[PDB]
Design a protein around this ligand. Structure first.
Ligand SMILES: Nc1nc2c(ncn2[C@@H]2O[C@H](COP(=O)(O)OP(=O)(O)CP(=O)(O)O)[C@@H](O)[C@H]2O)c(=O)[nH]1
Lengths: 694, 9
């Protein structure tokens, strides 16, 4: 009822998370763990009395999907200690071995909790010593993982010690546990739990050997304080320099140092994250180290139980909720001395894969569209065709699993078993060489436009998409032109820049064309139209520069509608492109695969079999992280091929890798199939079809 | 793992 000022003392804070296989009990465990102490969500906090002193324990949301690298790894470096949860019936699984691997990767100290022991007693009918056998082999399994993947400084005192209470046993549904210290201190042994269980005398058991007591005791007695933890954690956590005065702001858990925090997850807008150094209050100033912008906070607050509560000044080593943070990502390093963030600069990316969806039941018609658009703005990478009845809607995102998650929102959560189309790869179109000049006549023959199109230099393209140069109509030509002139472009061309559009640009290099300024917006609409659908397979265009070299505009707007400016410039752009050797581009993925060494060849061979290439390779002892690039079109079904080849011990993710040119040998076939899917004639139009005659 | 046996008795 007044516990808000434990946060002063860092060595009573416990930053922890629960690692578990699925159905193994983790949600239940957490619910009755923290209900047991009084009072997905981002973070939920509980205060617990251990040895007369009160501890503030942080239970942070931690996903467990092993086909998700990034989220899982992010949540687990957010925490300092972990409760590994294993079903006693099922045991240590390959997936358990994985989540343990990452847990232990970023120096997270572990404690084991065998759950579902009631199932052993009532349902599975074991002798006490069969239970001893089964407990001890789960323990031994885990301790050969700790043997195998722990840092050399830790692989024998980071083991789990049944005898010192680093291993609890119990039932999360029946709110009971047992460890040897709790026995030491209460005289409760297994015979009574078995007995009471068998009578069905749950309520006695509840309060003869209470879950949250035994478990949280194990937490405090064995999982480390933030200042306990950062002493070895922050160096491994990211490639900075410790000699910074900010280095031992983060090395210990210094509140009076510069503040430094990271966002763990986002939720009206509310960001939950961890404070590494310093102290936030509402309204100071914060530079978001690599999200382009910088900002400040409207409310600051902390967590009491499951409930969002508001306070002001919070020191380091705690978990905070903040609002007002516009474009912060999950994983956002927020601090104000500018340094480099704790994980890599993540490309913001465009959606690259699509599936078509149809409701089974006629009655789910009315506003599926805004459900799916709840998630379309929940996850910024998603786009869909809104409204009317098409068949209905295309869902476009970042990959197969990305989307199929959303499918199992279509019914784990909302009520519809669903039929989904095959997936299609969003391809794009571009050119390889510069064109001769091309003319665009309007139908009334009164307006003419002389253009060339040129392949865009990858430096400038990169510049546009990593944000250095901005999308949209140019709001400051003089400044933009310079930044184009920094990359190998002619300033006296760059100054006529007019528009940036989806990896292309439009430049006015005309001298004294009367009335051009009157059509220029229409010229841009036509430009955009020209880019929206390419001339090869009506796919979006990338890496093209359209330069207007000359023009003849009529003096009366009666001869200058959209009806005349659009087709003229649009087909000029397509004609030019067809003369500039137009090509297909496909999306790639960066694939990050983390495994035990024994499997590498298999992994490697798999990537080779998907037109993929190994890019990089990071090794830490017996754990191996392979980084590759492979085309999206070749990556379907990867979770299966890879689960098979690494026997479910691979932990992996993808990131957008940009787009690359499709080889000519496969290009044609792919173009014909795209056109065919689109209801078009397979054979791509050539320049003679697109350009007008004599 | 000797502590484990203490829990049974
Ligand atoms: N017999 C028994 N059942 C348990 C115990 N703990 C959990 N369960 C059961 O297992 C089922 C799934 O466990 P749960 O805690 O939901 O696991 P989870 O982490 O939420 C997996 P999901 O994300 O799919 O919901 C629940 O119905 C619960 O009744 C236990 O100690 N004993």
């Amino acid at each position: 009822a007044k516990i808000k000022e434990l946060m002063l003392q860092p060595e009573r804070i416990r930053n922890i998370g629960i690692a578990a296989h699925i159905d193994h009990g983790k949600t239940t465990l957490s619910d009755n763990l923290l209900a047991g102490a009084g009072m997905n969500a981002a973070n939920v906090s509980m205060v617990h009395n251990y040895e007369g002193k009160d501890y503030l324990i942080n239970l942070i949301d931690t996903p467990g999907h092993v086909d998700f690298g990034g989220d899982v790894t992010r949540a687990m470096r957010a925490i300092d200690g972990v409760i590994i949860v294993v079903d006693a019936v099922e045991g240590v699984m390959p997936q358990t071995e994985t989540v343990v691997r990452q847990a232990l990767r970023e120096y997270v100290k572990p404690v084991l909790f065998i759950n579902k022991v009631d199932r052993l007693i009532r349902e599975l009918k074991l002798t006490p010593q069969q239970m001893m056998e089964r407990f001890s082999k789960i323990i031994m399994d885990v301790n050969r993982l700790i043997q195998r993947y722990a840092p050399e400084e830790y692989k024998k005192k980071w083991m789990v010690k049944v005898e010192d209470g680093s291993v609890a046993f119990g039932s999360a549904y029946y709110n009971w546990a047992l460890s040897v210290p709790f026995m030491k201190r209460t005289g409760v042994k297994f015979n009574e739990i078995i007995d009471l269980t068998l009578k069905g005398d749950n309520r006695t058991l509840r309060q003869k050997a209470p879950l949250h007591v035994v478990v949280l005791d194990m937490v405090v007695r064995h999982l480390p304080s933030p200042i306990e933890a950062q002493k070895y954690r922050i160096p491994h956590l990211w490639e900075g320099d410790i000699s910074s005065d900010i280095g031992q702001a983060m090395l210990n858990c210094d509140p009076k140092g510069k503040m430094v925090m990271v966002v763990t997850k986002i939720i009206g807008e509310v960001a939950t994250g961890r404070v590494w150094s310093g102290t936030v209050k509402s309204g100071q100033e914060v530079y978001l180290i690599n999200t382009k912008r910088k900002a400040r906070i409207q409310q600051v607050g902390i967590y009491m139980g499951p409930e969002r509560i508001n306070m002001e000044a919070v020191p380091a080593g705690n978990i905070v909720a903040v609002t007002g943070l516009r474009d912060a990502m999950a994983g956002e390093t927020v601090a104000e001395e500018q340094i480099e963030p704790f994980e890599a600069l993540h490309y913001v990316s465009e959606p690259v894969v699509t599936v078509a969806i149809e409701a089974k039941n006629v009655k789910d018609l009315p506003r599926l569209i805004e459900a799916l658009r709840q998630l379309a703005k929940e996850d910024p990478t998603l786009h869909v065709k809104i409204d009317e009845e098409t068949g209905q809607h295309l869902l476009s995102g970042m990959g197969e699993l990305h989307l199929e998650v959303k499918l199992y929102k279509l019914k784990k959560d909302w009520g519809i078993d669903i039929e989904v189309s095959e997936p299609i790869v969003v391809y794009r179109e571009s050119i390889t060489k510069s064109s001769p000049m091309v003319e665009g006549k309007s139908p009334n023959r009164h307006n003419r436009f002389y253009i060339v199109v040129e392949p865009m230099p990858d430096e400038i393209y990169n510049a546009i998409k990593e944000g250095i140069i901005p999308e949209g109509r140019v709001k400051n030509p003089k400044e933009v032109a310079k930044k184009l002139a920094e990359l190998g472009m002619d300033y006296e061309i760059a100054r006529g820049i007019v528009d940036i559009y989806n990896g292309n640009m439009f430049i006015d290099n005309t001298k004294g064309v009367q009335y051009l300024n009157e059509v220029m917006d229409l010229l841009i609409d036509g430009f955009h139209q020209a880019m929206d659908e390419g001339p090869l397979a009506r796919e979006p265009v990338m890496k093209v520069i359209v330069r207007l070299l000359d023009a003849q505009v009529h003096e009366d707007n009666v001869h200058r509608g959209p009806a005349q400016i659009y087709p003229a410039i649009r087909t000029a752009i397509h004609c030019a492109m067809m003369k500039s050797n137009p090509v297909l581009y496909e999306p790639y993925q960066k694939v990050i695969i983390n495994i035990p060494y024994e499997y590498m060849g298999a992994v490697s061979r798999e990537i080779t079999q998907r037109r993929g290439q190994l890019v990089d390779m990071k090794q830490e002892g017996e754990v191996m992280t392979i980084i590759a690039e492979a085309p999206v079109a070749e990556m379907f079904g990867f979770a299966g091929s890879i689960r098979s080849a690494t026997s479910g011990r691979a932990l992996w993710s993808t990131e957008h890798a940009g787009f690359k040119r499709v080889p000519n040998e496969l290009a044609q076939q792919i173009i014909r199939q795209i056109r065919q899917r689109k209801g078009l004639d397979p054979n791509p139009p050539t320049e003679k079809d697109v350009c007008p005659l004599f | 793992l000797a502590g484990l046996s203490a829990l049974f008795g």
